[PDB]
Amino acid sequence: VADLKAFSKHIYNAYLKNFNMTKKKARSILTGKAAPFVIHDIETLWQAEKGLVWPPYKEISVHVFYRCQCTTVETVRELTEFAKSIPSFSSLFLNDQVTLLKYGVHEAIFAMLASIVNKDGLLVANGSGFVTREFLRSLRKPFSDIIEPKFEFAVKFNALELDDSDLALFIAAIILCGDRPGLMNVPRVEAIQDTILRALEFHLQANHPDAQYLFPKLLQKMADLRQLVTEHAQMMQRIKKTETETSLHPLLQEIYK
Amino acid sequence: DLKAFSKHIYNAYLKNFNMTKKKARSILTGKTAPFVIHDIETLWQAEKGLPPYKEISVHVFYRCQCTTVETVRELTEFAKSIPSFSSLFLNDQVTLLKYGVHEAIFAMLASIVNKDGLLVANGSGFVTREFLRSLRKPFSDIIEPKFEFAVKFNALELDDSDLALFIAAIILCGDRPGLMNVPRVEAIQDTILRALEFHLQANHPDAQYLFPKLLQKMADLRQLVTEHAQMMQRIKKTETETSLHPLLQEIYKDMY
Ligand SMILES: CCCCOc1ccc(-c2c(C)ncc(C(=O)O)c2C)cc1CNC(=O)c1ccc(C(F)(F)F)cc1F
Ligand SMILES: CCCCOc1ccc(-c2c(C)ncc(C(=O)O)c2C)cc1CNC(=O)c1ccc(C(F)(F)F)cc1F
Ligand SMILES: CCCCCCCO[C@@H]1O[C@H](CO)[C@@H](O)[C@H](O)[C@H]1O
Ligand SMILES: CCCCCCCO[C@@H]1O[C@H](CO)[C@@H](O)[C@H](O)[C@H]1O
């Protein structure tokens, strides 16, 4: 009992230590209590690229696509240090850690993306900018069809009203997953995953005591997250096939191979 | 600062390797004597006072995989202690270790070996080379070539300060297949080799042609592991009864 309480406290500390944007910091900005420069067209995007403190320019949709890859690459840096900060994770052999991150970071990215989003847009560049969803909708396909489902997911996910102490356990349960293809020491990860999910439902009882059925709802979001990454990797197969102009970051080439 | 770079790696070496060449040379010269293992009985005694048992040759082969698995644990933390290495994305770290740990292992074996055998079990035992030769093929064909290299490598008379820079150059190799950030690695390797060459002329001022000799040993090690990888693959096909540690199954999966 007092082990899961200590486990939750340590994972939450890793979370706050390594991630650049909490859901608390983002709700502060999106409610005007922390103003981000609104990016809604080519005009404000060019000003942002000159004014905001953040490859050959091919076009507008491809430029935004490169900005998205930067976010992913940077978040993967943080997601590594978050998982490395978990002793059970660092105990695994280093190649099993890569297997977990390879199949794990994108599920965790789309969950954390809900933490910096309302139904009208998202926060970019350390919270100093707000890119409207309608401007993202107006990009040309496939780049439009890639971004839009992440909003539709982030809206339904934000209905559960999790805070950062909830997400730290939730994201940790995402990475420490025994279902990953090619895992060397499978039952070891399954044991770690069970400890975190137990720690999650225990923390959900204390922090969200009146919320009924919250834990089985979160498990469903973990299933919805596997589908979202499945469909995402399918659209990435299309970008590498039809978009000969767009280059792909080497870290994303390794993930989608 | 190259002077600080070499000193940091030498610190990570002492910080992560229980058995240094300095410690091992004390035990092999006489300044507690190791328990000599030369037959089945002394091996049996050592298992008490120092996987399903198939036979003796496979049992020793199982205890060799234990040393490799443990030495890979130490090498991982040694590489992680090099801050330039930790900045690499985790997948690139694995690639360097995957194709590098065994070149590093076969070089570090020479630190605990004389012409008559090697130290085992944290230095509390000495396994003879004739007892390793007495094992049946292919287990005898896998171990003896390591002795040949280990004795020729000991002729360079390196100490731990040299080996620390030598091991770091093996791990941080730009030629590893599947490397993501190739230029970054090639830069780090170039820094270590500069630090090694600079450290060699200061520590071995009279050693003629020492640095280009060590570069030949690095190529020699790449040949030894390639030959060692093939022998392991034939074992995985011929010997159904002998099981491989999953960490070695991942390493030898693609080595040709
Ligand atoms: C609920 C939120 C949905 C939107 O968020 C999404 C959705 C999908 C992706 C994505 C894409 C498109 N392609 C490949 C991958 C992959 O990693 O496989 C990923 C993860 C990225 C973001 C994150 N976006 C950004 O951070 C961002 C940054 C700057 C700008 C700016 F316009 F100002 F320049 C625009 C931006 F949108
Ligand atoms: C110059 C030194 C040469 C000998 O050292 C060698 C050579 C090859 C290997 C090896 C093998 C056989 N197979 C696969 C791999 C692989 O990793 O691919 C490796 C690296 C291991 C050792 C290290 N030996 C031991 O540590 C050891 C431990 C206990 C016992 C005991 F008998 F007491 F139980 C005997 C031992 F020899
Ligand atoms: C900790 C020591 C590091 C050595 C581990 C050996 C590396 O294994 C490799 O892990 C990769 C995914 O992680 C796989 O894609 C490769 O097929 C496999 O060869
Ligand atoms: C920091 C997160 C790292 C995640 C990057 C994704 C990992 O890439 C994979 O790395 C393996 C060896 O390194 C290769 O065998 C695989 O073919 C490759 O796809």
XYZ file of C-alpha atoms and ligand atoms in Angstrom:
625
model
C 0.000 0.000 0.000
C 2.722 2.441 1.061
C 4.809 1.172 -1.870
C 2.315 2.323 -4.504
C 2.084 5.677 -2.716
C 5.873 5.992 -2.925
C 5.852 4.779 -6.536
C 3.332 7.461 -7.519
C 5.331 10.180 -5.763
C 8.547 9.215 -7.570
C 7.016 8.978 -11.057
C 5.294 12.336 -10.569
C 8.704 13.771 -9.637
C 10.232 12.387 -12.843
C 7.312 13.877 -14.780
C 7.718 17.391 -13.365
C 11.501 17.110 -13.714
C 11.690 16.309 -17.436
C 8.574 17.522 -19.307
C 8.625 21.126 -20.528
C 4.856 21.697 -20.290
C 2.427 20.474 -17.641
C -1.339 20.431 -18.016
C -1.409 22.926 -15.134
C 0.912 25.382 -16.889
C -1.191 25.009 -20.042
C -4.579 25.580 -18.386
C -3.037 28.722 -16.881
C -2.096 30.074 -20.313
C -5.303 29.033 -22.092
C -7.283 30.798 -19.332
C -5.152 33.958 -19.255
C -3.904 33.554 -15.672
C -0.192 32.890 -16.351
C -0.435 36.302 -23.921
C 0.526 33.708 -26.544
C 0.771 34.998 -30.105
C -2.068 33.517 -32.157
C -0.911 31.824 -35.381
C -3.898 31.620 -37.739
C -2.531 32.232 -41.265
C 0.629 32.549 -43.356
C 0.952 36.167 -42.193
C 1.098 35.412 -38.449
C 3.162 32.254 -39.035
C 5.910 34.220 -40.794
C 5.911 36.809 -38.003
C 6.094 33.959 -35.485
C 9.021 32.371 -37.334
C 10.792 35.734 -36.951
C 9.537 36.777 -33.510
C 9.018 33.602 -31.475
C 11.917 31.898 -29.682
C 11.677 28.371 -31.090
C 15.457 22.786 -43.728
C 14.784 24.107 -47.256
C 11.403 25.832 -47.322
C 9.301 23.800 -49.755
C 5.786 25.095 -49.014
C 3.454 26.040 -46.169
C 2.039 22.629 -45.271
C 5.490 21.034 -45.437
C 6.894 23.775 -43.208
C 4.302 23.074 -40.502
C 5.053 19.367 -40.929
C 8.702 20.026 -40.069
C 7.629 22.001 -36.995
C 5.582 18.981 -35.895
C 8.566 16.649 -36.264
C 10.617 19.041 -34.125
C 8.013 18.755 -31.374
C 8.086 14.958 -31.587
C 11.894 14.758 -31.614
C 12.102 17.139 -28.660
C 9.379 15.284 -26.746
C 11.160 11.971 -27.371
C 14.178 13.509 -25.631
C 11.986 14.262 -22.609
C 10.136 10.931 -22.744
C 13.501 9.151 -22.608
C 14.601 11.055 -19.499
C 11.199 10.426 -17.904
C 11.434 6.665 -18.461
C 15.123 6.641 -17.506
C 14.136 8.368 -14.255
C 12.043 5.292 -13.353
C 14.351 2.751 -11.639
C 12.409 -0.257 -12.935
C 12.802 1.036 -16.492
C 16.545 1.702 -16.196
C 16.978 -1.798 -14.753
C 15.917 -3.266 -18.109
C 18.644 -3.875 -20.663
C 19.188 -0.869 -22.890
C 17.770 -2.488 -26.032
C 14.528 -3.379 -24.253
C 14.325 0.291 -23.268
C 14.549 1.307 -26.931
C 11.859 -1.228 -27.855
C 9.564 0.325 -25.243
C 10.285 3.871 -26.426
C 10.097 2.913 -30.117
C 6.513 1.642 -29.796
C 5.611 3.834 -26.820
C 6.514 7.489 -27.341
C 3.809 8.219 -29.920
C 0.997 6.877 -27.739
C 2.387 9.049 -24.938
C 2.766 12.062 -27.237
C -0.872 12.097 -28.309
C -1.982 11.753 -24.686
C 0.223 14.638 -23.549
C -0.924 16.673 -26.565
C -4.374 16.883 -24.980
C -2.737 18.718 -22.061
C -1.982 21.768 -24.259
C -5.142 21.921 -26.377
C -8.648 23.336 -26.379
C -11.230 22.796 -29.086
C -9.831 25.784 -31.072
C -6.073 25.194 -31.301
C -2.871 24.240 -29.530
C 0.054 25.843 -27.717
C 3.376 25.938 -29.570
C 6.925 27.026 -28.687
C 7.043 26.705 -24.899
C 3.519 28.091 -24.549
C 4.481 31.412 -26.179
C 2.295 30.744 -29.235
C -1.173 29.401 -30.004
C -1.819 27.766 -33.384
C -5.505 27.733 -34.267
C -7.154 24.464 -35.248
C -8.802 26.111 -38.267
C -5.397 27.046 -39.693
C -4.298 23.435 -39.207
C -7.517 22.290 -40.889
C -6.688 24.536 -43.861
C -3.373 22.822 -44.641
C -3.409 20.568 -47.684
C -3.824 16.816 -47.455
C -2.415 14.535 -46.168
C -1.109 16.962 -43.548
C -4.673 17.985 -42.681
C -5.887 14.408 -42.214
C -2.911 13.637 -39.960
C -3.454 16.433 -37.415
C -7.260 16.492 -37.158
C -7.856 13.100 -35.414
C -5.481 14.167 -32.631
C -7.855 17.016 -31.775
C -10.911 14.737 -31.861
C -9.062 12.423 -29.482
C -7.712 15.218 -27.273
C -11.226 16.589 -26.756
C -12.696 13.273 -25.584
C -9.595 12.640 -23.470
C -9.817 16.038 -21.754
C -13.351 15.123 -20.670
C -11.865 12.796 -18.038
C -10.322 15.899 -16.383
C -7.006 14.346 -15.384
C -4.297 16.421 -13.736
C -0.527 15.997 -13.975
C -0.289 13.531 -11.078
C -2.718 11.350 -13.039
C -0.840 11.721 -16.335
C 2.562 10.854 -14.844
C 1.208 7.420 -13.919
C -0.782 7.180 -17.159
C 2.176 7.976 -19.419
C 4.436 5.672 -17.393
C 1.936 2.849 -17.961
C 2.082 3.647 -21.686
C 5.858 3.233 -21.955
C 6.168 0.215 -19.618
C 4.114 -2.051 -21.876
C 4.673 -5.779 -22.286
C 2.770 -5.969 -25.583
C 5.562 -4.282 -27.542
C 6.861 -6.277 -30.540
C 10.297 -7.757 -29.949
C 10.483 -7.445 -26.164
C 13.335 -9.519 -24.756
C 12.191 -9.954 -21.130
C 8.403 -9.861 -21.520
C 7.112 -11.048 -18.091
C 9.492 -8.591 -16.411
C 7.801 -5.685 -18.196
C 4.351 -7.193 -17.560
C 5.243 -7.192 -13.859
C 6.315 -3.535 -14.002
C 3.222 -2.568 -16.008
C 0.987 -4.205 -13.392
C 2.635 -2.271 -10.554
C 2.023 1.037 -12.339
C -1.595 0.223 -13.219
C -2.172 -0.769 -9.596
C -0.496 2.483 -8.546
C -2.717 4.337 -11.027
C -6.032 2.958 -9.775
C -4.856 3.570 -6.209
C -4.018 7.197 -6.973
C -7.320 7.536 -8.854
C -9.159 6.443 -5.697
C -7.450 9.131 -3.608
C -7.242 12.029 -6.072
C -10.574 11.431 -7.884
C -12.646 9.827 -5.116
C -16.091 10.671 -6.531
C -15.255 9.810 -10.157
C -16.896 6.473 -10.939
C -15.444 4.042 -13.488
C -12.442 6.302 -14.109
C -9.816 3.539 -14.215
C -11.609 1.297 -16.779
C -12.248 4.445 -18.824
C -8.507 5.183 -18.841
C -7.745 1.626 -19.970
C -10.085 2.260 -22.896
C -8.139 5.425 -23.733
C -4.989 3.287 -23.808
C -6.771 1.085 -26.338
C -7.951 4.128 -28.288
C -4.340 5.324 -28.222
C -3.042 2.140 -29.856
C -5.585 2.621 -32.643
C -4.666 6.296 -33.062
C -0.981 5.445 -33.511
C -1.904 2.576 -35.838
C -3.852 4.937 -38.104
C -1.099 7.536 -37.689
C 1.630 5.171 -38.900
C -0.597 4.307 -41.867
C -0.787 7.972 -42.874
C 2.978 8.226 -42.365
C 3.378 5.389 -44.865
C 1.488 7.606 -47.309
C 3.668 10.659 -46.657
C 6.851 8.697 -47.343
C 5.263 7.371 -50.559
C 3.484 10.361 -52.125
C 5.358 13.353 -50.641
C 8.707 13.024 -52.392
C 9.465 16.651 -51.495
C 9.141 16.220 -47.730
C 12.131 14.809 -45.897
C 11.730 12.788 -42.705
C 13.736 13.174 -39.514
C 16.059 10.169 -38.993
C 14.507 9.479 -35.583
C 11.082 9.106 -37.212
C 12.559 6.964 -39.993
C 13.816 4.523 -37.348
C 10.457 4.420 -35.545
C 8.418 3.708 -38.701
C 10.535 0.843 -40.069
C 39.955 20.183 -22.807
C 41.440 16.837 -23.877
C 43.255 16.498 -20.547
C 39.930 16.666 -18.694
C 38.276 14.428 -21.296
C 40.776 11.602 -20.757
C 40.623 11.975 -16.975
C 36.813 11.759 -17.016
C 36.829 8.523 -19.037
C 39.529 7.107 -16.755
C 37.223 7.914 -13.829
C 34.257 6.179 -15.488
C 36.555 3.200 -16.082
C 37.484 2.851 -12.405
C 33.888 3.662 -11.435
C 32.343 0.813 -13.445
C 34.861 -2.072 -13.669
C 35.371 -4.220 -10.576
C 38.428 -5.990 -12.030
C 41.145 -3.647 -13.283
C 44.399 -4.730 -14.874
C 46.103 -3.357 -11.754
C 44.100 -5.577 -9.393
C 44.420 -8.582 -11.700
C 48.206 -8.245 -11.969
C 48.497 -8.379 -8.175
C 46.536 -11.643 -8.046
C 48.526 -13.162 -10.928
C 51.926 -12.246 -9.432
C 51.381 -12.745 -5.703
C 51.255 -9.551 -3.658
C 44.560 -14.473 -1.249
C 45.703 -16.917 -3.929
C 43.029 -17.859 -6.491
C 41.483 -21.322 -6.467
C 42.782 -23.138 -9.547
C 40.164 -24.828 -11.751
C 41.713 -27.498 -13.979
C 39.288 -30.462 -13.912
C 35.687 -31.456 -13.246
C 36.206 -31.864 -9.497
C 37.741 -28.427 -8.867
C 35.009 -26.954 -11.064
C 32.420 -28.734 -8.914
C 34.095 -27.483 -5.733
C 34.184 -23.929 -7.114
C 30.440 -24.055 -7.831
C 29.883 -24.652 -4.097
C 32.651 -22.733 -2.322
C 33.215 -19.734 -4.618
C 19.943 -23.579 -16.419
C 19.701 -27.392 -16.508
C 23.082 -29.115 -16.375
C 23.658 -30.828 -19.714
C 27.423 -31.454 -19.675
C 30.730 -29.868 -18.690
C 31.507 -28.127 -21.990
C 28.046 -26.542 -22.095
C 28.218 -25.669 -18.388
C 31.399 -23.631 -18.906
C 29.803 -22.104 -22.004
C 26.863 -21.101 -19.797
C 29.167 -19.427 -17.267
C 30.894 -17.550 -20.097
C 27.556 -16.070 -21.162
C 27.120 -14.949 -17.546
C 30.400 -13.023 -17.694
C 29.396 -11.419 -21.000
C 25.938 -10.410 -19.743
C 27.493 -8.915 -16.613
C 30.329 -7.213 -18.507
C 27.756 -5.743 -20.899
C 26.004 -4.277 -17.854
C 29.293 -2.671 -16.805
C 30.088 -1.467 -20.334
C 26.640 0.123 -20.649
C 27.187 2.229 -17.530
C 30.739 3.018 -18.647
C 29.436 4.371 -21.958
C 26.551 6.162 -20.225
C 29.154 7.857 -18.019
C 30.620 9.522 -21.140
C 28.362 12.612 -21.420
C 28.830 12.818 -25.198
C 27.525 9.249 -25.426
C 24.422 9.877 -23.302
C 23.361 12.786 -25.530
C 22.948 10.313 -28.403
C 19.395 9.108 -28.959
C 18.862 5.845 -27.107
C 18.588 3.775 -30.295
C 22.035 4.948 -31.415
C 23.454 4.022 -28.003
C 22.242 0.439 -28.441
C 23.747 0.158 -31.928
C 27.176 1.195 -30.639
C 27.004 -1.310 -27.784
C 25.479 -4.081 -29.924
C 28.388 -4.154 -32.385
C 30.964 -2.928 -29.872
C 30.695 -4.709 -26.524
C 32.335 -7.902 -27.775
C 35.296 -6.092 -29.315
C 35.590 -4.385 -25.928
C 35.136 -7.665 -24.041
C 37.862 -9.515 -25.928
C 40.275 -6.655 -25.208
C 39.390 -6.429 -21.511
C 39.844 -10.200 -21.220
C 43.590 -9.684 -21.704
C 43.716 -7.717 -18.431
C 42.839 -10.821 -16.375
C 44.797 -13.390 -18.406
C 48.319 -14.792 -18.465
C 49.662 -17.486 -20.759
C 48.190 -20.239 -18.543
C 44.580 -19.148 -17.997
C 42.280 -16.463 -16.658
C 40.767 -15.194 -13.427
C 37.079 -15.797 -12.687
C 34.528 -15.026 -9.968
C 35.762 -11.583 -8.896
C 39.349 -12.858 -8.823
C 38.708 -15.710 -6.368
C 39.465 -18.379 -8.983
C 41.840 -19.157 -11.834
C 40.619 -21.255 -14.770
C 43.442 -22.934 -16.666
C 43.832 -22.754 -20.427
C 44.441 -26.507 -20.742
C 41.078 -27.173 -19.078
C 39.499 -24.799 -21.601
C 41.343 -26.616 -24.395
C 40.156 -29.938 -22.941
C 36.524 -28.990 -23.632
C 34.917 -30.492 -26.719
C 34.520 -28.670 -30.002
C 33.162 -26.186 -30.851
C 33.610 -24.818 -27.319
C 37.376 -25.304 -27.586
C 37.491 -23.566 -30.981
C 35.717 -20.518 -29.535
C 37.884 -19.872 -26.457
C 41.430 -20.575 -27.663
C 41.540 -17.784 -30.321
C 40.753 -15.269 -27.564
C 43.869 -16.412 -25.691
C 46.065 -15.883 -28.760
C 44.896 -12.282 -29.069
C 44.988 -11.648 -25.314
C 48.660 -12.633 -25.076
C 49.744 -10.613 -28.121
C 47.726 -7.690 -26.762
C 49.502 -7.882 -23.394
C 52.777 -7.274 -25.255
C 51.787 -3.613 -25.645
C 52.024 -3.311 -21.826
C 49.000 -1.044 -21.489
C 47.633 -0.005 -18.107
C 44.114 1.017 -17.113
C 44.536 4.667 -18.117
C 45.283 3.506 -21.665
C 42.536 0.873 -21.758
C 39.927 3.378 -20.552
C 40.579 5.445 -23.682
C 40.941 2.271 -25.753
C 37.560 0.850 -24.719
C 35.829 4.202 -25.224
C 37.173 4.320 -28.794
C 35.767 0.841 -29.483
C 32.263 1.692 -28.243
C 32.200 5.111 -29.951
C 32.768 3.697 -33.438
C 31.376 5.533 -36.451
C 31.322 2.462 -38.705
C 28.587 0.562 -36.858
C 25.784 -0.618 -39.171
C 22.461 1.141 -38.775
C 23.891 4.250 -37.126
C 21.495 7.194 -37.204
C 23.734 10.216 -36.482
C 26.919 9.073 -38.212
C 28.820 12.423 -38.250
C 28.247 13.073 -34.540
C 29.705 9.672 -33.636
C 32.671 10.072 -36.002
C 33.438 13.360 -34.239
C 33.308 11.780 -30.774
C 35.543 8.927 -31.933
C 37.989 11.424 -33.433
C 38.083 13.191 -30.056
C 38.747 9.978 -28.112
C 41.504 8.892 -30.505
C 43.097 12.331 -30.189
C 42.801 12.002 -26.411
C 44.251 8.483 -26.624
C 47.187 9.458 -28.844
C 47.913 12.470 -26.627
C 47.681 10.281 -23.519
C 49.977 7.640 -25.042
C 52.919 9.960 -25.725
C 52.649 11.351 -22.184
C 52.248 7.977 -20.436
C 54.462 5.882 -22.762
C 57.053 8.453 -23.884
C 59.462 5.775 -25.136
C 56.856 3.517 -26.785
C 57.582 3.616 -30.511
C 54.637 3.321 -32.927
C 52.268 2.624 -30.019
C 49.236 4.499 -31.357
C 49.260 2.970 -34.884
C 49.857 -0.425 -33.258
C 46.677 0.024 -31.210
C 44.747 0.981 -34.353
C 45.800 -2.380 -35.788
C 44.504 -4.068 -32.627
C 41.145 -2.354 -33.159
C 41.021 -3.834 -36.652
C 42.272 -7.132 -35.203
C 39.367 -7.085 -32.734
C 36.856 -6.436 -35.517
C 38.158 -9.581 -37.239
C 38.047 -11.598 -34.010
C 34.400 -10.752 -33.310
C 33.343 -11.430 -36.904
C 34.927 -14.877 -36.576
C 33.448 -15.261 -33.092
C 29.990 -14.335 -34.391
C 30.109 -17.087 -37.023
C 31.094 -19.711 -34.442
C 28.162 -18.670 -32.242
C 25.742 -18.945 -35.175
C 26.849 -22.498 -35.969
C 26.318 -23.325 -32.290
C 22.763 -21.979 -32.479
C 22.107 -24.338 -35.407
C 24.109 -27.471 -34.574
C 23.613 -27.636 -30.790
C 19.878 -27.791 -30.097
C 20.375 -28.657 -26.414
C 22.517 -25.593 -25.652
C 20.459 -22.427 -25.148
C 21.655 -18.884 -25.804
C 21.091 -15.925 -23.513
C 18.475 -13.658 -25.161
C 20.879 -10.701 -24.953
C 23.356 -12.642 -27.084
C 20.573 -13.714 -29.453
C 19.865 -10.045 -30.192
C 23.537 -9.198 -30.751
C 24.302 -12.086 -33.126
C 20.977 -11.730 -34.950
C 22.431 -9.731 -37.867
C 26.213 -10.154 -37.544
C 27.864 -11.561 -40.675
C -4.174 17.593 -30.197
C -3.069 18.310 -30.936
C -3.012 18.008 -32.413
C -1.955 18.798 -33.136
O -0.658 18.362 -32.712
C 0.032 17.479 -33.500
C -0.562 16.504 -34.284
C 0.236 15.675 -35.063
C 1.623 15.811 -35.087
C 2.477 14.944 -35.944
C 2.522 15.176 -37.334
C 1.721 16.259 -38.000
N 3.282 14.429 -38.148
C 4.019 13.445 -37.620
C 4.062 13.167 -36.263
C 4.921 12.029 -35.784
O 5.696 12.234 -34.831
O 4.805 10.937 -36.370
C 3.273 13.922 -35.380
C 3.249 13.650 -33.889
C 2.185 16.826 -34.314
C 1.416 17.658 -33.520
C 2.049 18.734 -32.688
N 2.144 20.000 -33.401
C 3.031 20.928 -33.045
O 3.790 20.781 -32.091
C 3.076 22.176 -33.869
C 4.136 23.060 -33.679
C 4.236 24.228 -34.414
C 3.280 24.540 -35.364
C 3.380 25.797 -36.167
F 2.406 25.907 -37.063
F 3.319 26.896 -35.420
F 4.519 25.883 -36.848
C 2.221 23.670 -35.571
C 2.146 22.514 -34.829
F 1.099 21.685 -35.052
C 41.404 -14.580 -23.114
C 40.354 -15.269 -22.277
C 39.635 -16.364 -23.022
C 38.613 -17.089 -22.185
O 37.533 -16.199 -21.880
C 36.398 -16.259 -22.645
C 36.380 -16.613 -23.983
C 35.167 -16.666 -24.658
C 33.965 -16.386 -24.015
C 32.666 -16.476 -24.734
C 32.115 -17.747 -25.005
C 32.794 -19.027 -24.606
N 30.945 -17.884 -25.646
C 30.289 -16.783 -26.030
C 30.742 -15.496 -25.781
C 29.929 -14.328 -26.259
O 29.655 -13.427 -25.443
O 29.580 -14.320 -27.453
C 31.967 -15.312 -25.120
C 32.531 -13.933 -24.844
C 34.014 -16.067 -22.659
C 35.208 -15.998 -21.962
C 35.238 -15.636 -20.504
N 35.203 -16.808 -19.639
C 34.765 -16.735 -18.382
O 34.455 -15.669 -17.853
C 34.664 -18.022 -17.624
C 33.920 -18.041 -16.447
C 33.784 -19.200 -15.704
C 34.378 -20.376 -16.125
C 34.246 -21.631 -15.323
F 34.707 -22.698 -15.966
F 34.917 -21.578 -14.176
F 32.987 -21.912 -14.994
C 35.123 -20.375 -17.294
C 35.240 -19.212 -18.018
F 35.970 -19.246 -19.158
C 22.322 -3.436 -23.545
C 23.329 -3.951 -24.548
C 22.861 -3.621 -25.946
C 22.914 -4.854 -26.819
C 21.511 -5.274 -27.197
C 21.504 -5.872 -28.588
C 20.697 -4.990 -29.521
O 19.528 -5.652 -29.950
C 18.865 -4.990 -30.967
O 17.692 -4.281 -30.418
C 16.890 -3.645 -31.482
C 15.662 -3.046 -30.891
O 15.967 -2.503 -29.624
C 16.488 -4.644 -32.554
O 15.791 -3.938 -33.603
C 17.673 -5.331 -33.114
O 17.247 -6.353 -34.074
C 18.482 -5.975 -32.058
O 19.686 -6.503 -32.650
C 14.953 7.558 -27.851
C 13.854 6.740 -28.499
C 14.445 5.862 -29.581
C 13.357 5.327 -30.488
C 13.896 5.211 -31.897
C 13.307 4.002 -32.593
C 14.281 2.846 -32.504
O 14.747 2.507 -33.791
C 15.129 1.184 -33.899
O 16.456 0.994 -33.280
C 16.943 -0.393 -33.432
C 18.352 -0.493 -32.958
O 18.734 0.695 -32.298
C 16.879 -0.873 -34.874
O 17.216 -2.274 -34.922
C 15.528 -0.682 -35.435
O 15.511 -1.139 -36.826
C 15.140 0.741 -35.351
O 13.835 0.933 -35.933
